[PDB]
Write a new protein. Sequence first.
Lengths: 231, 229, 272, 342, 57
Amino acid sequence: DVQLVESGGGLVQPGGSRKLSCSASGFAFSSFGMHWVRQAPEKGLEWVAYISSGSGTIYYADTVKGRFTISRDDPKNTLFLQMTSLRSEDTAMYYCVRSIYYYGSSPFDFWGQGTTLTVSDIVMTQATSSVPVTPGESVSISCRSSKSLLHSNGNTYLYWFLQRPGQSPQLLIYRMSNLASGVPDRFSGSGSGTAFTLTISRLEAEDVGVYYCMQHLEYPLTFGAGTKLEL
Amino acid sequence: VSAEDKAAAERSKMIDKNLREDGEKARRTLRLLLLGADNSGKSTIVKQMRGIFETKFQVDKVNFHMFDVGGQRDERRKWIQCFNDVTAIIFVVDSSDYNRLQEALNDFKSIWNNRWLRTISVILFLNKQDLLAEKVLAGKSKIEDYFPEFARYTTPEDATPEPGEDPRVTRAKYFIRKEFVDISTASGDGRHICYPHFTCAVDTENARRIFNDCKDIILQMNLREYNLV
Amino acid sequence: MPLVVVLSTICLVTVGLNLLVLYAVRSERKLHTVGNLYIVSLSVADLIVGAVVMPMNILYLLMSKWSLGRPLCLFWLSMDYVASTASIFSVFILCIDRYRSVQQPLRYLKYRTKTRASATILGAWFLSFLWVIPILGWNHFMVRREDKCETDFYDVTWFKVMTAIINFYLPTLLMLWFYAKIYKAVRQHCQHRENRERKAAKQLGFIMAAFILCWIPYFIFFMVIAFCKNCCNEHLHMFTIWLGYINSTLNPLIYPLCNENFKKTFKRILHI
Amino acid sequence: SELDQLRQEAEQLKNQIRDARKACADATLSQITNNIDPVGRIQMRTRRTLRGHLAKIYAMHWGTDSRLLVSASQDGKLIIWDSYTTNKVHAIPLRSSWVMTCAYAPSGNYVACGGLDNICSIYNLKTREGNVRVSRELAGHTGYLSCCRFLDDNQIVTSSGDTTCALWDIETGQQTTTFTGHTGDVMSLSLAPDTRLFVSGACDASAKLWDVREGMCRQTFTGHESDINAICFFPNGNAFATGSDDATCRLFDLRADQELMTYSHDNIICGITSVSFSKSGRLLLAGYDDFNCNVWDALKADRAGVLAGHDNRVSCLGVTDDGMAVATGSWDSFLKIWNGSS
Amino acid sequence: TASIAQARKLVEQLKMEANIDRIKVSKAAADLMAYCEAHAKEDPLLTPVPASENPFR
Ligand SMILES: CC(C)CCC[C@@H](C)[C@H]1CC[C@H]2[C@@H]3CC=C4C[C@@H](O)CC[C@]4(C)[C@H]3CC[C@]12C
Ligand SMILES: CC(C)CCC[C@@H](C)[C@H]1CC[C@H]2[C@@H]3CC=C4C[C@@H](O)CC[C@]4(C)[C@H]3CC[C@]12C
Ligand SMILES: CC(C)CCC[C@@H](C)[C@H]1CC[C@H]2[C@@H]3CC=C4C[C@@H](O)CC[C@]4(C)[C@H]3CC[C@]12C
Ligand SMILES: CC(C)CCC[C@@H](C)[C@H]1CC[C@H]2[C@@H]3CC=C4C[C@@H](O)CC[C@]4(C)[C@H]3CC[C@]12C
Ligand SMILES: CC(C)CCC[C@@H](C)[C@H]1CC[C@H]2[C@@H]3CC=C4C[C@@H](O)CC[C@]4(C)[C@H]3CC[C@]12C
Ligand SMILES: NCCc1c[nH]cn1
């Protein structure tokens, strides 16, 4: 089965260095681009870095550019993140995310379990922080963007993720309308221009969690604040 | 182009890089088409040198890939288009069987005059010469019964028979060879050549004979593009 | 004045022929063979001669004094020496490729990869660019007038003899020996199948006589000028270098034009 | 005695069918469509050139989204192209390089191919591992695989050089139905739009209409003088066109059970490799050995235009489901996308 | 007895093909002409679309 295991996290001193590893099994690692995404405690998701398949293209977030180095070892199927000059702002859970890019592909489909590190631009808005819900009732979640996510090629590069309590994020909707593999049909993504809606018909107990909307129109990839569902 | 399109275009260029590497390996390998009848014994030559039966034998660090399209029937006018760019065709006949020689001559004529094989040289093998020598030595059956022109055929002075070979064996052996070569010289205009050989079921020099013949085919290809021929 | 008209046509023909050869390879996919990479490299060097070296040399004849200034005189010498040397080495590497593909046709197939051919082309041009160092750094390492644009090391005897052997004499001897071996195989190849050898003798003669006759007077004069230091004449010196420039014009008419695929490609594009 | 009597009865039945077809041949399609105006001159430009195949292209098939296509070449490579951007989506290395056909599943999740290896290989395009893998190898044909077409994700029809066509259950790997009756190598097949019937053309110069569910030959169409290489259903499913080595294309009608129109020219003396219809069926596009693709007026048998963009044989062609473009594959190792402009 | 067995099958097949209902060629020709006429406007190859609507600009 597809697996992504992160290691190397732990408590480090300010100004120190730490090396994070992501071992991949069960899929063609060299065929997938890889992202590092971190999540500060009691905060939303934040994209860190990206390395493409074949190591030809590398992107970093501005808050980490110059201090973090991302690399991969295709024969060993290992993804690395070398961090230097670590600050208290870097305390987060770091997730290893695979993403393959071709016509009709589903990027960000699999996330790792994550490793915890503790140190001693299009704006995506999710104004509704929490939503009280009841099972079997339809729920809608709204996301907004400062720029239009509709590209001239017809794609609207908006993604929806669900992070159940204690679990890694899972892809629900990719490019604002398509349903990710293994996701029940009750989830539906609707949007236009800068306004997007995630509709959850016949809500169940498993659907309870935090929902994030991410834009993939351009780098840096930015996440919404997140909308929490509670019973 | 969007961020995902640039990623998609990068994936495409990595595909092109692997396609170029595969095309470089195909240039180093020489492809051969092994044709012959059931009685030809073409399965013996490949085994000693070692749907579609594919064989890879290496001579002097040169890789040869030989193909045998087994099965089906004499209606091969369709799949013969696939082998439009093979380096050579290895056609194997049985010289001992005088009865089916005319079928082999008719079969060879179709291959030589095929629309899709106008530039492919033929490495002709006349297999089972040891059996033919015994058949001629016994004298029970005469070639002249099947081919009337054999009675008026005389061995050319340019012939160089091997030592220890009966003159009657040489006269019959060179008559069968001339029948195939007469077909080759009828047309072609020098685009393709025939390389007749005499082999036996226990011959261990078959791999080098193809190697020396394929060298002449490649050399002629290089000389034409240099305008030296 | 009438001489400039004749020389201007030669410059235009050189640029036109070499541009036509370069674009024909790009358009046609049947011309993407490994052996045509060397022909592309040969036409590039001749294009630089026609585009840069020839027009400056023509102006040098119109006005005897070098009117383009000191910094531009050194640039012209660098372009003249690098492009001409690259053209000579492009012919040499092309002769090696044809030699190895004839002596060992099956064995050389593995080593004919475009990757190795491109390294050979880069190696030939890398040595060609080494002419820039003596042209510019002669004063730093080791009779000059502003009117002329002669090289600083023109009077040196030992250096010119050493460079002439490497630039022309050594490659020419190997090319004579390589094409002699090729003619041995071509004659043997034709005799094995069946005076048809006149096809190779005519082609090998045209390839070698044009290369030698267009360059032998210059490299003979290359070392004679240093021997006596006064035997040289400017009128004769300009005659020798123009013969070297003619070889650049003749290269498209020898290697690409004699090829069948190039000839078919040339006829298609010209007739549109 | 009995054998001689039976073969005489076959001749009587053949005359009965020939008389029956002649009885209903009251008019000609040429006479019916004489009044309608011609399509004019059809001018198509090469919008895209797909490069990357390093050998002869033998087959191509559009996906149902009118954007993705799969092509097969005898460099042992199956390539899936994004025709809008010319991006390569996949490159599938084939175990046997002697491929003759390729098919794109209507769902888009699978592609199929096969050739002289007598095997139809099914490739899964949507795997959790991120790579294309072989999901099934359909063995059972005793000749080369000449054509294959998906009915759905679980069923595929293959035509072979062993004179038979087969319907396969992909999940079990067994051929549920075998279609016999051709006396020569079956070179092509076309599926009806409802996938209840399919026509096949063989080297006996005859085209047979087969019922998929029932599994027998319903009708036999003759009239060609040489091997049939290509066949294509009319968009409404009531007719089909064939292409043969005799430099002719013929339009046969299923319900009239006879030929309706012949598409040939005196200049054309080369064989035909591929045939297809435009979305409305008004245009019949045919690929030829003379390096060209001729666009015919299906109703009036007029050569509407020429696609001249290849330096070798046009081996295959196909028109998108939305009718927007036509792709041509060729022995020169290139694919080209054509459409007109206002 | 291989030929006699094959003869029975070929004769039996010709009986099925000879018992089908055939419409007139004029009726079949009209249906083909009608289908082409009805779908003529939605055929991009027959009537090229404006460049704005052409995915292959
Ligand atoms: C104008 C002159 C003086 C400057 C030199 C021009 C050079 C840099 C340009 C002009 C023509 C160009 C060549 C045109 C054709 C080819 C063949 C192709 O397969 C590789 C690139 C290559 C080899 C190009 C390399 C760069 C090139 C040689
Ligand atoms: C600068 C001077 C001193 C050295 C010049 C280097 C020349 C003479 C040497 C270096 C590389 C050598 C070539 C290397 C490989 C081959 C292939 C072989 O099958 C024939 C000889 C041949 C073609 C050599 C010819 C001579 C050669 C070109
Ligand atoms: C004075 C300047 C303009 C001269 C430029 C010379 C160099 C840079 C040019 C001229 C000829 C060119 C070569 C021509 C052919 C090939 C083969 C191709 O498959 C790789 C690139 C390569 C190897 C080119 C590399 C660059 C090249 C060597
Ligand atoms: C005549 C003398 C002075 C100059 C000759 C230049 C040519 C023939 C010589 C000089 C540099 C040599 C090259 C040096 C490096 C390489 C890379 C290697 O992987 C293959 C051999 C190859 C490609 C050599 C081929 C021959 C070469 C290009
Ligand atoms: C294509 C044909 C015309 C080529 C003919 C080549 C010869 C005849 C032409 C071409 C270049 C010409 C030379 C160009 C430059 C000079 C230097 C000048 O101070 C004396 C005349 C002289 C020496 C010319 C003599 C004739 C010449 C060598
Ligand atoms: N005009 C030729 C200059 C040169 C090149 N190489 C040596 N000298």
